[PDB]
């Protein structure tokens, strides 16, 4: 029963079209709760969950100050990256940052994260011990030496083990009805003939939360990893997720195939069989 809090930020340079676009989103597990978009009208951190709306003006002002100041810092970081890589001011580049923490079911700290990617590749990351860095190339080694000199890891560790954990614990309690819920999957099976002797069986899992699920097909109790198509778990738009797994079977042999469903909302795994 572990939980996570993550913020994902993206700065994208737009040469000849103004300042870089900056977007930051905050999640608790699979639920988004805040956003910041430099293109939006407010220039403020905005609520994206019913349970966070109640936070007072000191919260919204402090969070706005932090995310806006980060957008201005990462705007300057795009310029520094152009200098490290000798890249022209005419091309579009991306700087992504992720940070956050994980807590166990008892609310105790489990893990902390702080990492950057430049143009879709790892640039520099704080290691699991929260005291040292992994640099992906020789330009990131220059950054690593600057951050060691300025004791940056000790400043990040303080947030990651303190404020981050306190914040996630508070959100899990405040947003309990949304965040601590489990929506088990609602399942159904469809059947469509594809040829004179073959049909497609499709096993559906709808309306579930959290997103983590496993759908597997078996033929006479044997794991069928071939003649199977699996789609990536996708958001429904209402706070739940969907997924399906399909198998091409010989006509008249539908009853030999079973679809197995595993999810946090199913204390025992479920087995589905056509008709």
């Amino acid at each position: 029963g572990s939980h996570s809090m993550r913020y994902f930020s993206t700065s994208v340079s737009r040469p000849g079209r103004g300042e870089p676009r900056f977007i930051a989103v905050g999640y608790v597990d699979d639920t988004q709760f805040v956003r910041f978009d430099s293109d939006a009208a407010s220039q403020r951190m905005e609520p994206r969950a019913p349970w966070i709306e109640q936070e007072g003006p000191e919260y919204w002002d402090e969070e706005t100050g932090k995310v806006k100041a980060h957008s201005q810092t990462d705007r300057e970081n795009l310029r520094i990256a152009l200098r490290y890589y000798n890249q022209s001011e005419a091309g579009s580049h991306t700087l992504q940052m992720m940070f956050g923490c994980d807590v166990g079911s008892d609310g105790r700290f489990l893990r902390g994260y702080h990492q950057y990617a430049y143009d879709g590749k790892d640039y520099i990351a704080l290691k699991e011990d929260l005291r040292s860095w992994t640099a992906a190339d020789m330009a990131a080694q220059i950054t690593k030496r600057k951050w060691e000199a300025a004791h940056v890891a000790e400043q990040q560790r303080a947030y990651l083990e303190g404020t981050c954990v306190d914040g996630l614990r508070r959100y899990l309690e405040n947003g309990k009805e949304t965040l601590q819920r489990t929506d088990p999957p609602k399942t159904h099976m469809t059947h469509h003939p594809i040829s004179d002797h073959e049909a497609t069986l499709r096993c559906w899992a709808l309306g579930f939360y959290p997103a983590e699920i496993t759908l597997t097909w078996q033929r006479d109790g044997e794991d069928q990893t071939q003649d199977t198509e699996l789609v990536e778990t996708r958001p429904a738009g209402d706070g739940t997720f969907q997924k399906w797994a399909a198998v091409v079977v010989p006509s008249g042999e539908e009853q030999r195939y079973t679809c197995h469903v595993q999810h946090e909302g199913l204390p025992k795994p479920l087995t589905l069989r056509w008709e």
Partner: peptide, 9 residues
């Protein structure tokens, strides 16, 4: 709670 520590690369 957003990270309060900002760093230049």
């Amino acid at each position: 709670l957003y990270l309060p520590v900002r760093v230049l690369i």
